[PDB]
Amino acid sequence: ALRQARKDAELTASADSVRAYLKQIGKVALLNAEEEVELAKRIEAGLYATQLMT
DNA sequence: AATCGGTTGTGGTCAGCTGCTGCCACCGGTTAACCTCCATTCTGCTGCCAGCCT
Q: What is residue A28's DSSP assignment?
């Protein structure tokens, strides 16, 4: 169906480098502000943790 | 008398650093409303699908 026609186009050659990169990066959802805040807090916590550990 | 080499009185001179004193290229870091996907011809190889065989 449209499912199989989606998947057969989903795995293809794509022998152009720009098109291959754009297809690759268009596979992750965007973020909102509280999610960005959560990620930044996780980054800072992990960075202080590895400094403290070494 | 000259003649092949020294001494040098003295006056520029001429560039070679030496500071030196700016000063001017050159390179790195920063900026915090918000807005997220570009002609023709010949030859050889590689993949397609029917068609007999166990």
A: S
